[PDB]
Design a protein around this ligand. Structure first.
Ligand SMILES: Nc1nc2c(c(=O)[nH]1)N[C@H]1C(S)=C(S)[C@@H](COP(=O)(O)OP(=O)(O)OC[C@H]3O[C@@H](n4cnc5c(=O)[nH]c(N)nc54)[C@H](O)[C@@H]3O)O[C@H]1N2
Ligand SMILES: Nc1nc2c(c(=O)[nH]1)N[C@H]1C(S)=C(S)[C@@H](COP(=O)(O)OP(=O)(O)OC[C@H]3O[C@@H](n4cnc5c(=O)[nH]c(N)nc54)[C@H](O)[C@@H]3O)O[C@H]1N2
Ligand code: SF4
Ligand code: SF4
Ligand code: SF4
Ligand SMILES: [Ca+2]
Ligand SMILES: [K+]
Ligand SMILES: [K+]
Ligand SMILES: [K+]
Ligand SMILES: [K+]
Ligand SMILES: [Mg+2]
Ligand code: NA
Ligand code: NA
Ligand code: NA
Ligand SMILES: [S]
Ligand SMILES: [W+6]
Ligand SMILES: [Zn+2]
Ligand SMILES: [Zn+2]
Lengths: 130, 569, 81, 431, 269
């Protein structure tokens, strides 16, 4: 289904970045998609089920969680981090600042696993430069 | 290290030297009686030798200055430079810090004072001064709208207010009691202002006249080197000359008592051009500079600076928050503001002073009347409230206008709006300043009134070796006819020494030493000091947004601390 | 009986409850003005190790001011037994 | 167990300076007063990597090297680059930031901070229309109307509301009861749950709502019956609440800097705040993110004349956000090398910028393992500002506060690393 | 006289070439033109290092026609501040094409980057492809923008076209994205295609004409009615248009927005 992706802070994502972006708690805080219970019923999913998020700019697998901060109808929330930044709009409109918030995306349930932090970064294929 | 500056025409008003050919000897940062035969020679034949320039009022370091820099990228695009051997910089009216130090040194200035420092933001002023090369400097903390000052002076407790000022000058590493629109900027904390010297701000119930008188008494009880430094209420309004003259009389019966230096005046009034307006509105507006000049001529307790209009596109930045909002309401240009908790306010607005527009033309004439109708240059300093009336790089043009009635008449009869002739007496004044009088208003008056004349503003034995050499021959130049050569020579000094080391050679910067930070060290009765400190800390716990322990400026911020003593036990 | 109960696992350590409490504000001028205490003081609760921590429960009057100040229901008035 | 008081928190722009650190045998083991985030920065989480030595990438694996070897290779990269990008800076102190500006001049680099992904649009706006602000103590002591527009302080500046809203001030002695709290956000955030008025507007329509509010403020009719999902009558009522304030403060965040219009959303909010001063005293404060993002823009401005996106390729400074910002230089493939300091673009830049980071040399001056170190060729670990190193930081409304050294580290400070890098870049440029 | 610049391979680090203009080429031989300085990142290089040069010199810029016979997608500031003569680019250009130009003509056969005609004073710019953001805009912080000249884009353009415009004319034959005429003071903007949102946002004066559909508009505008067969600064535009005055969020605003009736019924109150 087509939804609007909003991204930003959570206190839990804050605690995780300061504890360690190499820990399991960062995957648990930032590789997630918050949604209203009504949207979870439309998709036929439950908390803890994985979701494939696709935009014009990329793709990512994140874990569904029920939103404790209610969303307007048709909006979802992925906390800021490398999972969110696989799919948001990179273009700056000649300002230097990308479009991190309110991007149209396609979401469907998936049996694929969420990628941990080092594995997710391998999608970019870093080539050693020295 | 030894230097001998040979065969120049010396101008040192404090020592009575008026263009005499003589040698100046230098050893390890000081002017001395004589040097050995191995001393390096600086040939000044056919040139003018003066003490290093001393600027008593400029906006060069701190919060309001940096908002002006940040929010004016177009001011930087207009004037961006990379100095050979130095740092990159930019800004025509609000230069970056390295460029500021370079441009003062290039025109032979070696000391400049930051005119308006908010106490809570003092660390910002000192950090900018660290990145300001060459010039010695000081910063003036603001007191005219401070909550502690207003509540102690309301009750007539000048002893407690003196203990608070002693602590604040040390905590901010400041030098002067600066007063800007007393009570008015507090009233601007609620969107208002005060009108005249008998109108109180809300709640505090203390008038501007009571703040001025009380702070002048505090200043002399603390035996500070400089006097109170006042920016009057009602800045820029037709008919404000009456408020100005009334303000000038408020501290007249207070006797000066500096511990350091030779100051003998109780009041310093800044950028008086903006405070000399007649009429009741802009429909019957006239210059009242002749009445202001007549008051200064007849009274012995006052020194002024002019705030001369340079006729440029510049930036206004002051601690007069409501005046800045009113300026934005008139020209519609971008407006910045910063109300600082319990202390002060500020605003920044760009401003175009066009020669062809009627109010800028009269404002230019008002400043010229103040310089030229004040008989004694010992009562005057050359300023532009930089950048408010124009950038400090225009001081050489101000000098050239003062030395040439031909330059003035070429502007008056040319582009300058006819209001300069109809609303002022400037076209009837043929007086031309001499080289001695120029030296008086650019280094002697300022050094003396600031309490620094034992070491600054003169070329006598015992002075710090801060020296400017200008490529002007006073035996052959006609300053009236050759006004563009005067302007050009004062803009690019042939040689500048700072603490006896060459920093400028043929208008180019060749060395970037760090300058000293002058600040005032005072000690009051231990019992009143302890009582005031307990009250200050209690008010921090309840009403400030920071903890008392983190408020004072740490020693790390002053690499060359130069304390000056006031009262001691 | 009804008494003060903390849920530190839900707490942000925002300090709204600490400041809003009239008992804490009366005992500490720093707290009255929005700061965490620096001077040594005995108050009902403080933010410690990032979460609300109840120190002197006997001083609580069960007024409900702290409860209105918490948007995440991390401090409550409920039956303690 | 020792208690170190009056400590400054090195996390967000609230820059709390009343932190108490619990110290046991050269280790910060706990805190008092710091929120959940601040506490997490101060204490070590078991299992998190804290690098003890510099590292260089070889062939997928990393090898430990000395500071001399790592700085030598980093200097060679910067010296040989035609368009080097020096990015981050917001989580270090002002002295290290000033060495950075000097190094960017020496290398002919572009220097830029996190403002280019944050309040950079607010900087573009304030340059065009102005900046009417105040310090936190004026909010605490005078404000009767507090607005949080497109910011969620309960999750992002956790002690901000307790310090500025619940606090009892000089003229607002009843604290929360003396203020009207307004929150503008498309979500029902934990900050909106505390508000007296929650304008739950349509996303990406703040500019449209602000146009209607400004026309109404100036005595004009609103053309449409509903704007950004808010009925005409309720827009008129919101404007009356603002006009009746004795002292109003507009706090704003990423909700309007990142969304449709970017800098023009801030521009219209600033102009509304300015025009409100004909009826009531009004000011604004951008909710600056990192504890020292503000300090970089202050340092960079006072030294060069420009705040961010500063290009020194031509010697004299030049400024063009949209051309000279980090994302512009990476996405347009102009940058040929990148030095990262005290920031994590690996985690926090969009995919299109990461694709460029995969193809160019990356130097990371970073203490912990992050997505940026996963993309790095050289890792140089420093002592952490506010815990193991001192220096100035600037709060969101420009108040400077000195950060403290609470415990000792054998690692070099960022300032020391940058001074050695500057000396080595000069040596390579000469040879 | 024609001077031909044939580009060699364009570098990945862009070139900045403000000296590519008839004013600099005037009075120089072919060998002197090859020595003209340009920037390649943080290094100063010669024009000849990145272009083959041929043709016939001329003493006056009005008699010079520069032909760039190839793609210069990574070359910035071509024609900056030119006063006379002509430039034809047989390919794309990067940012700042004709920035601050006072006279003469520039034709770009391909696409142009952002800031095409920034701060323009006079002359003509014609882009046969698409343009970026800030066509005919001002510089950061300045309240005084484009004061004259004509810019025509045959394709589409992006955001903030005519930002702070204070004279001249901009014609977009395709579509625009958001905020065309933002802070406009004077001048004329004609959009023959569509607008996504915020046309004339914060405008104080000037005229904006939209012949296609405006998806969204602004509540600060006053609706004046339908006007047919309109005429604006000599440009005759046949058909019916909804007329609006604003943006009344600005004090003393006198700007006009015309929107074609056929596809803007949802914009009229
Ligand atoms: N926990 C945590 N705290 C942090 C950080 C962190 O990484 N984690 N980083 C710090 C930094 S660098 C920054 S900049 C601050 C930022 O702090 P905030 O400015 O609070 O930033 P966000 O949480 O990204 O977004 C704020 C709100 O904008 C809303 N929003 C989305 N679209 C729109 C819109 O169209 N209109 C409006 N009005 N609102 C909208 C979102 O729903 C969200 O609640 O946080 C700082 N604090
Ligand atoms: N999708 C999405 N993406 C976003 C955002 C969003 O809302 N949505 N927000 C954006 C914003 S506003 C911002 S600012 C960025 C986040 O900005 P970043 O700078 O990417 O944020 P952090 O992950 O906090 O990175 C700070 C780094 O500094 C390191 N560090 C801490 N102390 C020190 C020190 O003393 N010295 C040095 N050298 N390093 C130190 C930390 O370990 C950490 O890795 O994210 C942006 N990206
Ligand atoms: S209990 Fe609630 S109000 Fe108190 S600190 Fe925790 S989150 Fe904040
Ligand atoms: S219930 Fe009332 S007294 Fe008890 S902690 Fe909460 S606010 Fe304080
Ligand atoms: S609010 Fe920000 S500065 Fe204050 S303790 Fe929490 S993270 Fe640290
Ligand atoms: Ca502009
Ligand atoms: K500037
Ligand atoms: K006297
Ligand atoms: K609750
Ligand atoms: K940690
Ligand atoms: Mg104040
Ligand atoms: Na939903
Ligand atoms: Na004052
Ligand atoms: Na005339
Ligand atoms: S930030
Ligand atoms: W940020
Ligand atoms: Zn003043
Ligand atoms: Zn001044």
């Amino acid at each position: 289904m087509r939804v609007i992706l909003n991204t930003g802070r959570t206190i839990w994502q804050g605690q995780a970045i300061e504890s360690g972006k190499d820990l399991k708690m960062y995957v648990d805080a930032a590789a997630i998609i918050q949604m209203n219970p009504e949207m979870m019923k439309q998709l036929g999913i439950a908390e803890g089920d994985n979701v494939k998020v696709i935009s014009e700019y990329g793709d990512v697998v994140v874990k569904a969680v029920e939103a404790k901060e209610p969303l307007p109808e048709g909006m979802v929330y992925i906390p800021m981090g490398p999972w969110a930044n696989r799919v948001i709009r990179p273009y700056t409109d000649s300002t230097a600042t990308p479009s991190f918030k309110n991007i149209p995306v396609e979401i469907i349930p998936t049996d694929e696993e969420v990628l941990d932090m080092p594995t997710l970064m391998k999608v970019y294929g870093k080539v050693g430069q020295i | 290290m030894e230097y001998i500056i040979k065969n120049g025409f010396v101008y040192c008003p404090l020592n009575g030297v008026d263009g005499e050919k003589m040698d100046i000897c230098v050893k390890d940062g000081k002017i001395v009686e004589s040097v050995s035969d191995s001393a390096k020679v600086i040939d000044a034949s056919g040139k003018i030798v003066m003490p290093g320039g001393v600027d008593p009022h400029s906006h060069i370091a701190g919060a309001k200055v940096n908002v002006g820099r940040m929010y004016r990228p177009e001011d930087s695009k207009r004037d961006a430079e990379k100095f050979k051997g130095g740092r990159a910089g930019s800004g025509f009216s609000v230069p970056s810090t390295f460029m500021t130090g370079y441009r003062y040194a290039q025109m032979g200035y070696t000391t400049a004072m930051e005119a308006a420092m908010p106490p809570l933001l003092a660390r910002h002023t000192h950090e900018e001064f660290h990145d300001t090369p060459i010039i010695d400097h000081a910063a003036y903390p603001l007191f005219g709208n401070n909550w502690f000052v207003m509540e102690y002076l309301k009750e007539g407790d000048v002893d407690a207010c003196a203990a608070y000022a002693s602590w604040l000058l040390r905590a901010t590493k400041g030098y002067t009691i600066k007063i800007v629109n007393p009570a008015g900027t507090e009233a601007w904390g609620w969107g208002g202002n005060v009108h005249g010297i008998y109108d109180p701000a809300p709640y505090f119930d203390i008038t501007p006249a009571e703040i001025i008188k009380g702070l002048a008494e505090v200043n002399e009880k603390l035996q500070l080197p400089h006097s109170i430094h006042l920016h009057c209420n009602d800045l820029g309004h037709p008919g404000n000359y009456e408020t100005t003259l009334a303000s000038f009389d408020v501290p007249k019966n207070i006797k000066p008592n500096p511990a350091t230096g030779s100051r003998d005046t109780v009041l310093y009034a800044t950028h008086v051009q903006f405070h000399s307006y007649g009429g009741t509105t802009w429909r019957d507006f006239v210059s009242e500079a002749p009445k202001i000049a007549d008051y200064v001529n007849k009274n012995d307790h006052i020194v002024i600076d002019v705030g001369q209009i340079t006729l440029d596109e510049t930036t206004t930045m002051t601690a007069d928050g409501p005046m800045e909002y009113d300026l934005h309401s008139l020209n519609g240009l971008k407006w910045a503001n910063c109300d600082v908790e319990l202390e002060t306010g500020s605003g920044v607005v760009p401003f175009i002073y066009s020669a062809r527009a009627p109010v800028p033309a009269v404002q230019w004439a008002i400043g010229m009347e103040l310089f030229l109708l004040i008989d004694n240059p010992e009562k005057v300093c050359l300023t532009t409230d930089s950048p408010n009336a124009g950038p400090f790089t225009r001081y050489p043009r101000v000098i050239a206008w003062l030395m040439s009635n031909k330059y003035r008449m070429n502007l008056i009869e040319g582009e300058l709006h006819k209001w300069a002739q109809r609303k002022s007496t400037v076209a009837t004044i043929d007086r031309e300043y001499t080289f001695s009088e120029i030296a008086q208003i650019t280094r002697a008056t300022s050094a003396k009134v600031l309490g620094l004349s034992d070491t600054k503003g003169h070329l006598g034995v015992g002075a710090d070796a801060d020296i400017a050499v200008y490529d002007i021959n006073p035996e052959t130049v006609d300053p009236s006819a050759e006004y563009m050569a005067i302007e050009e020579a004062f803009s690019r000094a042939a040689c500048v020494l700072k603490d006896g080391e060459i920093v400028v050679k043929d208008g180019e910067v060749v060395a970037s030493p760090h300058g000293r930070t002058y600040w005032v060290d005072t000690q009051v009765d231990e019992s009143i000091y302890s009582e005031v400190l307990a009250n200050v800390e209690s008010k921090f716990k309840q009403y400030y947004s920071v903890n008392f322990a983190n408020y004072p400026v740490q020693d790390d911020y002053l690499p060359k601390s130069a304390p000056v003593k006031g009262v001691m036990l | 009986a009804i008494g003060l109960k903390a849920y530190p696992e839900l707490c942000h350590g925002c300090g709204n409850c600490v400041i809003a409490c009239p008992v804490n504000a009366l005992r500490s001028p720093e707290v009255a003005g929005g700061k965490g205490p620096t001077d040594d003081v005995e108050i009902i609760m403080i933010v410690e190790d990032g979460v609300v921590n109840i120190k002197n429960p006997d001083l609580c009057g069960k007024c409900g001011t702290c409860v209105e100040s918490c948007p995440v229901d991390a401090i409550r008035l409920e039956e303690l037994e | 167990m020792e208690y170190v008081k009056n400590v400054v928190c090195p996390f967000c722009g609230t820059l709390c300076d009343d932190i108490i650190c619990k110290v046991e045998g050269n280790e910060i083991v706990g805190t008092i007063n710091a929120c959940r985030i601040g506490h997490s920065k101060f204490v070590h989480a078991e299992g998190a990597m804290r690098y003890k030595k510099p590292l260089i990438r070889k062939n997928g694996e990393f090898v430990e090297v000395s500071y001399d070897e790592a700085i030598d290779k980093a200097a060679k990269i910067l010296a040989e680059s035609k368009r080097p990008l020096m990015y981050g800076w917001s989580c270090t102190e002002c002295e290290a930031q000033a060495v950075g500006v000097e190094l960017a001049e020496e290398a002919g680099a572009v220097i830029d901070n996190t403002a280019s992904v944050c309040h950079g649009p607010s900087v573009l706006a304030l340059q065009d229309v102005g900046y009417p602000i105040c310090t936190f103590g004026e909010v605490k002591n005078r404000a009767d109307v507090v607005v949080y527009w497109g910011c969620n302080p309960m999750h992002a500046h956790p002690r901000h509301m307790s310090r500025n809203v619940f606090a009892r001030g000089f003229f607002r002695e009843r604290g929360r009861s003396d203020r009207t709290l307004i929150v503008v956000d498309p979500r029902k955030t934990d900050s909106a749950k505390l508000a007296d008025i929650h304008l739950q507007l349509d996303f990406d329509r703040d500019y449209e709502l602000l146009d209607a509010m400004r026309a109404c403020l100036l005595g004009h009719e609103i053309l449409y019956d509903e704007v950004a999902g808010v009925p005409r009558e309720q827009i008129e009522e919101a404007v009356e609440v603002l006009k009746n304030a004795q002292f109003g403060i507009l706090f704003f965040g990423m909700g309007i800097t990142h969304s449709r219009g970017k800098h023009r959303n801030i521009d219209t909010a600033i102009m509304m705040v300015q025009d409100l001063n004909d009826y009531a005293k009004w000011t604004l404060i951008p909710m600056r993110g990192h504890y020292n993002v503000t300090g970089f823009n202050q340092v960079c401005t006072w030294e060069s004349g420009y705040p961010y996106c500063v290009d020194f390729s031509g010697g004299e400074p030049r400024y063009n956000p949209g051309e000279t910002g980090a994302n512009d230089l990476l996405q347009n493939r102009e940058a040929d090398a990148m030095m990262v300091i005290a920031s994590d673009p690996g985690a926090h830049f969009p995919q299109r910028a990461l694709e460029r980071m995969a193809e160019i040399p990356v130097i990371a001056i970073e203490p912990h393992r992050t997505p940026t170190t996963e993309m790095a060729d050289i890792i140089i670990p420093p002592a952490i500002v506010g815990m193991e190193a001192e220096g100035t930081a600037y709060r969101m409304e420009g108040v400077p506060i000195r950060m403290k050294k609470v415990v000792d580290s054998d690692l070099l400070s960022d300032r020391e690393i940058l001074e050695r890098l500057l000396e080595k870049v000069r040596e390579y440029k000469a040879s | 006289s024609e001077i031909i610049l044939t580009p060699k391979e364009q570098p990945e680090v862009p070139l900045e070439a403000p000296n590519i203009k008839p004013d600099v080429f005037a009075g120089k031989s072919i060998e002197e033109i090859k020595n003209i300085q340009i920037m390649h990142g943080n290094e100063v290089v010669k024009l000849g290092d990145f272009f083959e040069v041929s043709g016939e010199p001329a003493d006056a810029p009005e008699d010079i026609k520069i032909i760039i016979d190839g793609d210069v997608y990574n070359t910035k500031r071509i024609g900056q501040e030119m006063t006379a003569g002509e430039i034809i680019v047989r390919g794309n250009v990067n940012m700042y094409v004709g920035a601050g130009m006072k006279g003469g003509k520039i034709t770009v056969e391909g696409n142009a980057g952002s800031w095409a005609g920034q701060d323009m004073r006079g002359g003509e710019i014609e882009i046969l492809g698409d343009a970026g953001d800030y066509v005919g805009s001002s510089y950061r912080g300045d309240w005084r923008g484009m004061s004259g000249g004509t810019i025509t884009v045959h394709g589409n353009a992006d955001n903030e076209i005519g930002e702070y415009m204070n004279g001249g004319k901009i014609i977009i034959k395709g579509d625009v994205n958001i905020m065309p005429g933002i802070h406009m003071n004077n001048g004329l903007i004609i959009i023959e295609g569509n607008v996504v949102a915020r046309a004339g946002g914060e405008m104080a004066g000037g005229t904006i004409v939209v012949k296609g559909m405006m998806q969204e508009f602004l509540a600060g505008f006053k609706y004046l009615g339908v006007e047919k067969d309109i005429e604006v600064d000599g440009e005759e535009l046949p058909g019916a248009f909804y007329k609006f005055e604003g943006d009344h969020a600005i004090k003393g605003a006198k700007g006009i927005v015309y929107a074609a009736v056929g596809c803007n019924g949802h914009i009229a109150p």
